[PDB]
Amino acid sequence: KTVFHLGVTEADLNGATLAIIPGDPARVQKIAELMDNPVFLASHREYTVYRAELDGQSVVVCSTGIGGPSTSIAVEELAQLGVRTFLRVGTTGAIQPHVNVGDMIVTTGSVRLDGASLHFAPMEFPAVPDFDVATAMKAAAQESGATVHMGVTASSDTFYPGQERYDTFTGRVVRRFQGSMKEWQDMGVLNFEMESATLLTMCASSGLKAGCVAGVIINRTQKEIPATLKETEARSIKVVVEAARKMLK
Amino acid sequence: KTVFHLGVTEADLNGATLAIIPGDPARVQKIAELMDNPVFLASHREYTVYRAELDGQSVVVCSTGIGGPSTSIAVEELAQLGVRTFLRVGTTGAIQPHVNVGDMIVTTGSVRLDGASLHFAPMEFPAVPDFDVATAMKAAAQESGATVHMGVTASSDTFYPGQERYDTFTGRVVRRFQGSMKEWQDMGVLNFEMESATLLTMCASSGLKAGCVAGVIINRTQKEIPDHATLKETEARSIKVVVEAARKMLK
Amino acid sequence: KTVFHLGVTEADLNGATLAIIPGDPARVQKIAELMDNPVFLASHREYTVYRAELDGQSVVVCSTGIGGPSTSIAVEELAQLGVRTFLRVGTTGAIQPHVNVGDMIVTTGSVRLDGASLHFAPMEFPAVPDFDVATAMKAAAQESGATVHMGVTASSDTFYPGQERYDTFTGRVVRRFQGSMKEWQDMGVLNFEMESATLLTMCASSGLKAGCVAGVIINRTQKEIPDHATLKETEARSIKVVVEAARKMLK
Amino acid sequence: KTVFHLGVTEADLNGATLAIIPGDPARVQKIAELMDNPVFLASHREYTVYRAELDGQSVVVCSTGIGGPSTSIAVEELAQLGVRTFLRVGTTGAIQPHVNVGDMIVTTGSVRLDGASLHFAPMEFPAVPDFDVATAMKAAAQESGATVHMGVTASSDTFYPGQERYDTFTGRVVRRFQGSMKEWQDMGVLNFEMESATLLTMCASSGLKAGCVAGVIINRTQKEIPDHATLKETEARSIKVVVEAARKMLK
Amino acid sequence: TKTVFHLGVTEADLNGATLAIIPGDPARVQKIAELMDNPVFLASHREYTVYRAELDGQSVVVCSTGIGGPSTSIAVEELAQLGVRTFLRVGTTGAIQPHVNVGDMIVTTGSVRLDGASLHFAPMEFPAVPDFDVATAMKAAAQESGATVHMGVTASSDTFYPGQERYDTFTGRVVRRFQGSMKEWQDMGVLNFEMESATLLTMCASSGLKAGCVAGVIINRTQKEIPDHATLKETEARSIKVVVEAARKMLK
Amino acid sequence: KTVFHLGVTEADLNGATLAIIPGDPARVQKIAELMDNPVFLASHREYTVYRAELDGQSVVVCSTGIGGPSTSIAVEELAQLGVRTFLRVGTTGAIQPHVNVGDMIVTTGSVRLDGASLHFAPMEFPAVPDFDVATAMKAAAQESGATVHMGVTASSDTFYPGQERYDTFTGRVVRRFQGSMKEWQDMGVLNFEMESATLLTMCASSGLKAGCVAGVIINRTQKEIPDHATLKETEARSIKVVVEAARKMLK
Ligand SMILES: O=c1ccn([C@@H]2O[C@H](CO)[C@@H](O)[C@H]2O)c(=O)[nH]1
Ligand SMILES: O=c1ccn([C@@H]2O[C@H](CO)[C@@H](O)[C@H]2O)c(=O)[nH]1
Ligand SMILES: O=c1ccn([C@@H]2O[C@H](CO)[C@@H](O)[C@H]2O)c(=O)[nH]1
Ligand SMILES: O=c1ccn([C@@H]2O[C@H](CO)[C@@H](O)[C@H]2O)c(=O)[nH]1
Ligand SMILES: O=c1ccn([C@@H]2O[C@H](CO)[C@@H](O)[C@H]2O)c(=O)[nH]1
Ligand SMILES: O=c1ccn([C@@H]2O[C@H](CO)[C@@H](O)[C@H]2O)c(=O)[nH]1
Ligand SMILES: [Cl-]
Ligand SMILES: [Cl-]
Ligand SMILES: [Cl-]
Ligand SMILES: [Cl-]
Ligand SMILES: [Cl-]
Ligand SMILES: [Cl-]
Ligand code: NA
Ligand code: NA
């Protein structure tokens, strides 16, 4: 009736079966403001929840927090309340030189460098989006006029060593991750983020539709920031909202 | 010059950048036969290579044989002569009761129950089709008015124990694969085949575009295997779909 | 300001080399209020930061959010700002019959059912606390008058399947975790939690000092589900115990 | 009493309990031709099947195609029809400088770099020939008067990256196989082929006798791709040797 | 009237002992029991030399384990069938941190599992951790000796040579897995190499038994590969006194 | 110039290139006394070392103790002093109903249920004997009139749970090994033993010749402790066979 972490009920969702799930609680409201009749529902820990409407239909907006453990909680509890479709929006670091700060990336498969995904399916199972959601997300991202890239995302449990950052307190990166970036680069992996491997594996093995779209906020091959930036977020959230439109009507 | 197993040259392909790759060599000619200017190129081991023309472009048809290892040879060597897109057509066993004998399945991702995918990318890497190919194949399948499913495929190095078959010489399945089919069923996996995990992982980690479309020849929830007039028909429909998909890619 | 997520500088910390790291941002304030001169520093995403004084020395307080990935960012950036000692306080589910709601557990080693710990050390490395931190935590816990258990904690990347919960949307639990609780019971594992394996492995392999203490808010084996009052007293006792442990660590 | 892929009944094999299993369908006839009363039985996909006699007893010749997946189908379906002894003959690449082209190698254990073996036994189980078969093979190989080597074989699911070939479309070798040849070479491993890991594991764990003998068609300390001048002579020796090994098994 | 397979002692022989001291080397069994009260030779079979003694009025077993977790697991299991619940290992170890000297004592607070037999008790993710009481008793016994005492992580290896990344061997070869592992353990703060603690701690920690491991540093791997003779018996002496003191504290 | 554990020199071995390596120190003298000129050399920890002569050649006899870690030190240190061939004789527990107490088993391959084998080669490498040594051992066993079985041996790092014994202090066997005996049984594994996986892998990957023969002292379909008289009988057979095997190697 009423879930452990989210602090909402089935009634609060008003028949919603699609969710937009940004990482940052501070983005939930932003996204809801782009839809119709946004209403605040609840906020507990990293879970801020809104209801809104698109084309006359209920949509839920719920933040995940950073990483797959907290993402998994959110997805499962919305699912218990009737949600069947999940559209993730986020920020990403690009690892290809042809990929630009400001570009959108739609994830066609994730490399599983996370742990939560294994709580749903064995390593050999693909971290793959629902086909309709990936489709809708590509359309939406191209409709924004930005450059869009479809493809493989490296989904890490850490922001630092698992993305091979060396500018850290120790300067160390464990063997498994030493040289990992060049390896992903040669395989044609586009980008780094931290939630998609869990999300996609969990959804694809559990009877749920999911996808991931992210705006590129940094490129790891050049490193340099241009600042501005907020527009990338602005574009990201317009695109995810658009994608939800296409899933609905 | 000449690639080692395929026995063809760059000139032989006549500028083709796309391939249809069935498993069965018998299918190579039947597929070429549906396009323009079918030309036989080579038959070596399990590799029978034709050239043909679609919309004024050369298309290669090349069989892979059964399993990832032999497929991996076909792809790599075709790639060396300049092929960049690979459309696999194969047969499959459904493991969902709603999926009927005759339906088509376009793989959106493969469970890697194979060995050869590991020779290209580590287990964590997704065995996923290139999105355009998968899109092309969906459209082609729908437009031919066939029941088409999009989903995850379990892609196994064996036909028997790795697909949890007990009607065998020993009757025994190793621990890893005992109860495995039911697990795949609970997760929503649609089908069993033997080549896609290798194909998809290889291509996606190598700068090549690939997809896998397969005709359902058996449903593993029913006991009784379907007849000859259905097998031959499934193959016929399947061949049509992949060629139509090839057309959509070329433009 | 000098770190990506936490948005503080080392100066903001006022000398602090010890941090108390609860999971819930809401509890950051309550912990700091048990000490001297609590000061709000920042709040970004799951990360709320306070400093305060214990016996005239600076202590930072910083939420982790739920799970190893968010925990790991907080620890690294706090380490970047000179923090060297990490006192984790949390809630836990018990799996031993002899451990009752309201007891304290001090982790002497974590079962690594997480993924982020593998980003600092391969699986064979022990998820173990700094001995000094564990000692201090035990002495703090006993001096509270509470019942205190020392032992192994199962630290899971999920709240549901990885803690073998079946009260879920699918009701399904992957093979790896089917029967996992029974196995942990038989092995004498004391409790389930979500951040200890990442924290302890990270610190033990990075020249940093860490321990974990948690209040038992449920016993999964017995189905002890407690009052809001009990839940409150337990939370209160935990926070108090961790502040005391902090006081013992301080020179 | 029939089988899915092979297209032959039990009667067709006329009581045969032993099969010679080359990889290449074109070697089936040639091996059959060295025996008595050879009869073509069937051909489907990579499976070409003959029957012949040695010393008044029936023997099956069946190609397996390239790799363990296609091999496992063949071995399983022969086994269903009463075959118990499997003698594989193939071509191999030698990785030790002291092994010459034209030499014979009898495998005494395989490095399992395949995937299909896992479908029969977990990785810890050795990929080991039946002692008798391997004895017969050694004897037959010596009698041919080529140099014969007994030892460990690396059996790979790929021709290219898993045998550390770099003259490829990408030139890329995944971390796991990057430096693998220098490792095998330093462990005294003798050669590379693609089927023995699957064959040996499968039989050794399933109540079946098996071995693998191979003609050296290339020395990998020299070149990557085999040249045609060589294939012809080494083949000739290989196929006589394996027929001699079979005669010896039958008594 | 139970009499175990390898040890060849009975429950009666232990006279109620619930604590054991378990050195690697049979030569040390008598030396340790000789530091105790009323030592009695019980049995010797294979690498298993067993004595009984008493300490602050309670029976104690001394039993060698031999080298490695396989032989250790047999001894621990068989002693447990006979009522033993607490196990204190003493041994030798090689230091891998520059600040740790020959002569120092190292008390293991957790082991890197580079063994095989630990997996026969618990899967890799389970921690090879001592019982907190024993480690405490061991810390305090060790400090009591006026040796420098170090608490930390120990790499517990199934080999003396490649697993501890020794190159001065027959082949000079080290398999990929252990190529450059020493530097990695150094970088992570790991203190020392030895061969029994992962099996011992994982086994007991998952089996309702109390265990710990204290070891004297016989070599520093920043200096040489092979351990020197002069250091041996002085470091042996202090080590066996430390373990005897730790058992006292355990017993009360 | 000496070795660290064995306390012997190259001089002490007097040119010997073959070793007989039993598990039990007690056995070393009894083996040596079956040859010419036995000479006690050293005894330190579990390593008793003798020298003797067989057909005018020096032979070393060196005990290993129980388990692969102590075995590995013994083989390494003997090899540093120029030993190249190692023949293990040990005791074993059969798991097949038709193997009797008293019988000999020569190992053709070991299931690697140990840890130390991984310190010389990764899991996929086969744990297999030198074919010459295994041939010598089979011959030595047949000619002495004992029953010999050739086959696969499960080589375990523990006596108890790794060999799926439940009559233990806990009655607990970890998931990995629950059901494993039946699995080994069903695959045709002959026996259980603790040293062969380490020895065979280490030697096969390091240019040394090795083998393992074992006297069956127990059958797990029986679970009985044998008579003093049948135990001593078996040991006498075991050692006679290994010495005869060593002789065939020197001829
Ligand atoms: O290079 C990047 C850019 C963004 N993120 C995202 O940043 C968030 C944490 O700040 C995570 O949720 C993750 O998805 C990365 O992990 N790496
Ligand atoms: O149940 C089935 C039916 C068909 N196939 C496909 O059939 C071929 C062998 O018959 C293989 O290439 C495989 O991809 C299966 O794997 N399983
Ligand atoms: O049975 C329990 C009880 C508490 N927690 C803690 O509760 C939080 C989830 O709400 C996590 O941070 C975790 O540490 C569990 O994971 N499992
Ligand atoms: O260097 C070589 C030489 C030959 N083969 C054998 O070549 C066949 C395909 O050409 C396979 O069956 C394989 O066993 C190799 O794998 N590698
Ligand atoms: O550098 C060292 C020093 C000592 N030991 C210990 O030495 C004993 C055998 O010599 C083993 O028990 C092992 O624990 C090592 O493993 N490495
Ligand atoms: O059932 C048995 C019988 C004997 N051994 C052997 O017995 C010795 C220990 O008693 C070890 O060397 C081992 O190789 C077993 O492992 N299992
Ligand atoms: Cl976000
Ligand atoms: Cl908390
Ligand atoms: Cl062949
Ligand atoms: Cl010792
Ligand atoms: Cl023995
Ligand atoms: Cl039993
Ligand atoms: Na094939
Ligand atoms: Na030993």
From TrEMBL, chains B, C, D, F:
Binding site for Mg(2+) 2: 100
BP terms from Gene Ontology: nucleoside catabolic process; nucleotide catabolic process; UMP salvage
Compartments in which it is found: Cytoplasm
Signal peptide annotation: none
Top-rank lineage group of the source organism: Bacteria
Catalytic activity, EC: 2.4.2.3
Top-level EC class as recorded in UniProt: transferase
Known catalytic reactions: uridine + phosphate = alpha-D-ribose 1-phosphate + uracil
GO CC annotations on file: cytosol
Primary location recorded for the protein, binned into one broad class: cytoplasm
Domain Nucleoside phosphorylase intervals: 17-245
Binding locations of Mg(2+) 1: 44
Binding site for cytosine: 124, 175-176
Keywords associated with the record: Cytoplasm, Glycosyltransferase, Metal-binding, Transferase
Record-listed cytidine 2 binding positions: 5, 163, 195
Recorded metabolic or biological pathway in which this protein acts: Pyrimidine metabolism; UMP biosynthesis via salvage pathway; uracil from uridine (phosphorylase route): step 1/1
MF terms (GO), sorted A to Z: metal ion binding; uridine phosphorylase activity
Binding site for Mg(2+) 3: 178
Family assignment from sequence similarity: Belongs to the PNP/UDP phosphorylase family.
Function: Catalyzes the reversible phosphorylytic cleavage of uridine to uracil and ribose-1-phosphate.
Protein name stated in the entry: Uridine phosphorylase
Gene name of this polypeptide: udp
